[model samples]
Target: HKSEIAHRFKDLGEEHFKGLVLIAFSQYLQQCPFDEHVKLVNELTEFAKTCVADESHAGCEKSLHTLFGDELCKVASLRETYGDMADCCEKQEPERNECFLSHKDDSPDLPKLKPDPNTLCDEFKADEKKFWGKYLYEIARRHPYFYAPELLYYANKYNGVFQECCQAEDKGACLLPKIETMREKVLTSSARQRLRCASIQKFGERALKAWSVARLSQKFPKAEFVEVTKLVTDLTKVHKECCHGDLLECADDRADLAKYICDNQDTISSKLKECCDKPLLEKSHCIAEVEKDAIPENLPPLTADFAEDKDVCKNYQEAKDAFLGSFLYEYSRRHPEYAVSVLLRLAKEYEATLEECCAKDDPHACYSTVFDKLKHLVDEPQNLIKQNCDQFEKLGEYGFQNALIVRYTRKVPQVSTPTLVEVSRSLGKVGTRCCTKPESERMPCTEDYLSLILNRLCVLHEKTPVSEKVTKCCTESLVNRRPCFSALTPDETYVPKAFDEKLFTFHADICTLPDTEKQIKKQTALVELLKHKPKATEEQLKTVMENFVAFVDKCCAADDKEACFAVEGPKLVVSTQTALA
Candidate 1:
């Protein structure tokens, strides 16, 4: 056993040692019997504490958490949701399958951790009516492009924790089931129950869809008259009559809904003609003109071909969706202003891709032909990440961690203080590869870790937008373990897209805001540090400023500018501390 210490276990740092131990322990635990499982799990918590003891204990709770808390939380949630997963209660394979299922399920135990959920909920509940005021302000403060009128729609709805209460049931993931539940209960339900029935999270979209032709023009004031009243009437009617019981309960998949409406041409022919006999535009002059160029903006036409050749379209849609339809959401919501510019550039690319692959042969395999090209096109916008590979390679551990934050959080405003320091605190272990493993060989490894900055942490400016971009960085688990990003990630992938992007309607779009804010906050932090240390020698100041700016450069793209500063602030204090000393 002594002669056979893990090749990966040569690592021992705040970041990597635990990472190594976690992998080693998990592999060991997969076959671990139920009786010894408790001992190993409990002892590893101590082992985690002792591992991080050398650096400091001030932030060791996070250590206790990862060593036990995080994994334990999942295990408990799994058990709570699905009873016994397996006899071993070990966390792997059949056990993983048996206990936990899907991301939408919320374990009551999650809030019940730490400072006590009951107390937290009691305070929250006492002022439920009042909290709505603060909650709305928070949403609008972060997302100003939110239309004002929709706020009343929410106030009329949301009965406080009802939606969150229902979310515990994993309703969001299964849309049809959620709709069925809502449709069944909405009419007879109590006000509070209605709030619970509606997620309230998408009150904006919900109201937009629910709006009759009368209210459609009122919402988009900037539109040309037809753009205002244009195809809104027909699309609503077609969907309400043909797709389902109401516009709200249309076919589940958005693209599928478009095809559904197109399929019902005979029933809604007159209305469909209004959209079809258009002034002309991209893809289909009729659809684009009616939908304001957004319906088929980056998608193919909605003819039977749109449905007949669904896979061809699906492949193209995915390429486009990841870029134009997602990120915080396709470009429209994330960066409403730049949404068009971003869309035009990528749309051209997608058309070109589709032509090369789909035009000649069977369209179904079209995306497969252009996967690499589309992948490149999708990855093109990630200049923030692509620009920093060498820094990750050269500076090693420090570079890897900071690069992770800068790249993913490029679109975010500021990461919170606790999250910033939490990652910094753990960087010692997370960055173990730099000290123990060769950096060149681990170039991608570090890049993957950097992706985790966005994938795992790095808070942002609750953007509204859409897109179709897929860089490999955030695609899978960088922790180099079994689950990859499974339970660890809040969202499975950090595939940044628009927070929300619909037809002409978009969310707050300030693609540059994240970068601008990071710089502003970065500058603000340095000034504060220098102001406090006004008396430090010129040499110390020079070294610290130079070093600090370098650090800021790599981490500038981080979602939370504030976060970048907190964790990075100490660098100057340490650098100057030594120089002055």
Candidate 2:
């Protein structure tokens, strides 16, 4: 709409009407059905040819009325929902463009006219074009906040469901569940965008831009920081226009955003070239789903200066969203190992803590608990390895593989069973090899092997979107992959904490066994101890092991070995708690 209108209006030196015409038509198009779009655009171009440089209010209304026909009243009636766009046509050319572009900020909360579940197969089979045309039209009007491309994205998803289900023997049965799932996804996607639009509406463009900067920079850690920040700066300009109901301007802005990325591919990341190479709609999806590049070496050290500042509460109170947005962007670029979700959680938790603490008389003193909460989250990676190592020790190679398949299948049930089994088998090989290695060598070795597994998963999906958990893990740095994987939420199909904890009697008579058998028993005990004290430092764990070994030797040399062992065994267990603490 913008491009065509721009060309025609520019020829007459009446470029302002391009926006005026486009805005009025965009609203009209929302009410207009899909089949009439081509005719409307054609008629709009013809009307623009007759337009004068100083277009009058009467002239603007006439052109709009001519183009909109019966729908002009419906378009004007939207003023009830979105302030006074009705009087926009009453203004002259100078004021008309601004009025049409700007309105009382509101979003649509209307329902979609979904096809009946029972009639879906019949409706789709009758005339695919008309059925989907209504689907797309209905989606557009309800989701007034969505861009043209986003609506197409939804349309694609809806059509894909019907395309598959209509071929099934039990068409209605297949359509029912799939349709529900797609609707759930559509609603989630809609809700996500609503929050985004709402964020921009509530916090101004800069705050939303700050968030985009944080997200994009973190996702492309190896890319130039300045370049990524600049790109987001341009992209959010689009957000400012689009979220405010200027779909024509929004479309143009989006295309320009796409163009800049495609043209300056080197400025972004070379990996995005293929994404850029695709046509506009496909390009959007590709760029959206593309995996984050690996982290660069020697980035700035991670800091929580925003959280630690004495005036943190005061600064946050002024522009809460912008403050947190900038904080996340700063924190994210420095800590690429943290997934976007993890970064978001950090911001959310920090804000919640600040809200509580800042309400107190002694805010600074109350803020002390913030560090404790953050430390637990920061220790997540270490805790993951500790759990995996213990699981490997108990389950062994094949047992671990079988258990992994079940766990991962539940974790990402959408992945095919065969693919899950393959991933499990490969990871099980790495687990058995690295987890059995000495404690000093385990983390580095496991990281190296697990990274290879992630590399394979990334390659398998390429530009395709994976499950959120898999995508999060795959985008992270080599060092962070396990923790990223560990944080994944499993599907409802799995039971939590299904594995039984290994029981150890820790008796001293066992110390009298052959050297090999005694050493094996001690090794098993070490794994159990590590599991119980995951928060304990490696040095602390080693010290605990040394103390336990020393006590065993002294007890074995005693006259009444059984009594010595029995008394000391319980003491040793309690000692670990205190010692590790």
Candidate 3:
């Protein structure tokens, strides 16, 4: 119904009539179940209202006015209904009852009509008080969404009076109180109130900026015009960046702001001269210099001889003793030319203490306990040189092989026979030192001495020298001594071939056997047993075999059996008397 009426007034030349029709249509669509249809109705209603409101539609002006009056009455009735619905919805819950009642006058225009304040005042005679109360209540309960309406109304009516009253105070005290009241009211309310609070605070910030600029301009006069302009520019930039801009975004702009302030440096100096003159600035600078001079050239030295009033000498001695014990003394001694001043200072301080100062309970003690403890660690010059030489010799021996390998490999890329000989000679030098007794000890010269020789030979082998001749000579002289038998074939001319072969084979086979003596004894016993039992029974033979096997196993199990034998045949008894005869 509202949409049809709105379309009928689409060509009407009055804004009020078209707006009323659109509002009615909008209300109707909000109640509609179909969102798409409601959206279409809303769009069309707004379009028709805008079209009719345009001033170019002059032909239907009179007709539009008559229609507008009737629609206005209808709109008023719908607004009343909307308010009653809102009240009903809000009243359903008790928690929200106070909120609704407190804000009852929040939407004055939404109600069907408003009472005439002038008429009410005429009738009541206490109208001013009633009117002010109603006005305050209305503003206090105003919705944040409709903030513009309240702001425009209040600003138009009372802004001039507010400014006049605020300016009368020394520092705009009256304005500050009103601003604080608004801030407190918004800050104390719920989430919905936050929106209003932000908007109000933004307006307050703008007003503050304006007031600050005015005050600054008054304080800095025409003679300091350049300085004032720089200050104004700095303040404007600070206000833009700090107040509204993201802090991170303004980080890079700080230098630019500083440059802007510094651009009027001469002007600032001139202004400072005008305010207090160069004498004052010069006096401040001179005072700073005097303060710096007031400090002593050096701090009072620490003291331990308070009772004797000999603190300076006592402290000097203590510092001298500490310096002598420290690495600082060694460093200064090593770099005497570079550290002469430090060494001279140290010597002078030490010489000032006529008597030795020790850290004992008795101040007159001549010997220091610290020096006594460190006496052993401090070496004589000769002993120190000897110790360093011994360390160098050991290090040289250890590093010799690695150095030889690196040098030889670099000089001779390939493993040539001659290169190997040179490398071997170098390795032998290292091995000789390792194997040789100390030059102070006598070398043993007997067969017992050969043990030491053998040890040296083993060491040489371990080094794996590349010189074949040196290795061969050492092996023959020390490793292959007379008792050491050859592994090769023996001569068959002096001895029978079979005998020599058998002997050589026996020795070779004996060397391979883990228990050579036991093997030989067992073979001899078996041969003897076979001779005795040439015709023994199979079962008797088995029993004999078992006995022999058990005897052999028992002998193997023994920790240290010299020889073992397995005898299986008849038991041969020898008479002790016949043996003795």
Candidate 4:
């Protein structure tokens, strides 16, 4: 009795019960058809619902609890599966009878429901057809029919499955023969072949689209710099080609692609630009902040000893130039107006200091002093202006003017300014004369002389002050003045228009003086008088021509013959020779 009880209890075990229920359900589902199964499930569900409603039946609550968990304690869990059992028991009597009958025959060997091999093969064939159908539909919608051959191959392979399943039992029963016949018809039929091609081409197009989306989303992040660059380059090329002749073609899509290309280009370009700019910006900000707090009301004057130190001056100049350039570049983006003004002011102050130092007949000292002043100015603007008013005023007049002009004409056409070349040539000429002349004849002119005359002219022309003056002068003389001289009467002397011009012309003419003289007697008397009065004063000779021959000779023998000959006595003699010869 105990063994029997255990066996019955074992049969009621969760696993065994679940197995019996599944077997009974599956068998009934197969035999009764789909509609009958639904009716039976409904009848059973109704019966269970009626039994649970009978409050007088004491065992009903226990039965309901056994079928479904305690409602309150497991409300959430009970709600999910309790409705199925309730619906099944509440179904109609006829349907309930069929469900009970089916349940009673729950033996595992009561003809296991096996899928028919033929039906399974047919189902698989249908599934394959569905897959291809969906694939072809997408292809036709998205792309053209260019992949016909591949489609025909796959179609034949899919249809071949049914034949293989049929032949699995008996080799001769295979429907492959029929499949071969159908394949031939489908492949040879023009209309079918075209459709197949269209379908396959559509598939290929979908494949390409899928691949493009997948590749862009998946691989772009992991792509090498070179690969990314290449992608950007390709996109750029496409944009250029597409938008080349037709601006209308540059729509939002194409512009997006162009932007992608441009962004990548900027990424590479910005790496270096940003790297360089960051430090400069930080340095500029640091300097500016330090300067804001560094101002002192009672700053001491730059000692003469400090001003005279060439090394200190050099250090100051270098730091000033560097800071100016750095600050200008750093702030140009945010405060371009202020940045330009600052740069011009700094440059002017430096140049003015340089000019003052140079005027003292000590170019090195001037350079050193100017440099120190500029350095101080950078860290202390108020003090710089106060302590160096001369420098600041000069800077205001020159450097600020130039900076303003540059800023104003920032977008102007980059046409060549002839004044720049002229200034350069003039400085070059002066340099050549100083270097080429003998030490005894050099008579080195002070930088002030050059600065006052050449720099003023350069400023008037709005040209660079630090031009090659000697070269500019030589070029101007050769190109514009030499021909005029060659055309003039060689023996005639004319009064010079201005002191500086006359001084330069005299030097030039004397340096290039010729040996042949047309007036033999005048030349002979000039030589004799130089032997008699070799030490005549430059001022005395202008008034006392005692003898024309003696005056001419004296002028000829002078160290600065051109300056001496510029006087009235020698000029009259030279003009007489020109008139008679």
**Top TM-score hit:** 2
List model 2 lDDT by residue over 287-402, tens digit each.
76676766667654443455455887888799886576666666676665554445555666677788998888988777655757865665565566688889888878765665
Worst 10 residues of 1 by lDDT: 242-251
Which lDDT tens digits does candidate 1 get at residues 19-54?
223322232223223334334544554544443443
What's the C-alpha lDDT at position 149 in model 4?
23
- Against the true structure, candidate 2 reaches a TM-score of 0.46
Give the Cα-based TM-score of candidate 3 against the true structure.
0.13
Candidate lDDT (C-alpha), each: 0.34, 0.59, 0.32, 0.32
- Candidate 2: give the clashing pairs: none
- Taking the tens digit of each residue's C-alpha lDDT, what string does model 3 give over 170-252? 43454455544543333222122222222223334333333223333323322143344356455444334322211111222
Listed in order, each prediction's TM-score against the native is: 0.23, 0.46, 0.13, 0.14
How far is 29's C-alpha from truth in model 3 (Å)? 41
Q: Which candidate, 2 or 3, has the higher lDDT? A: 2
Alpha-carbon deviation at 183 in model 1, angstroms: 26
Number of the top candidate by lDDT? 2
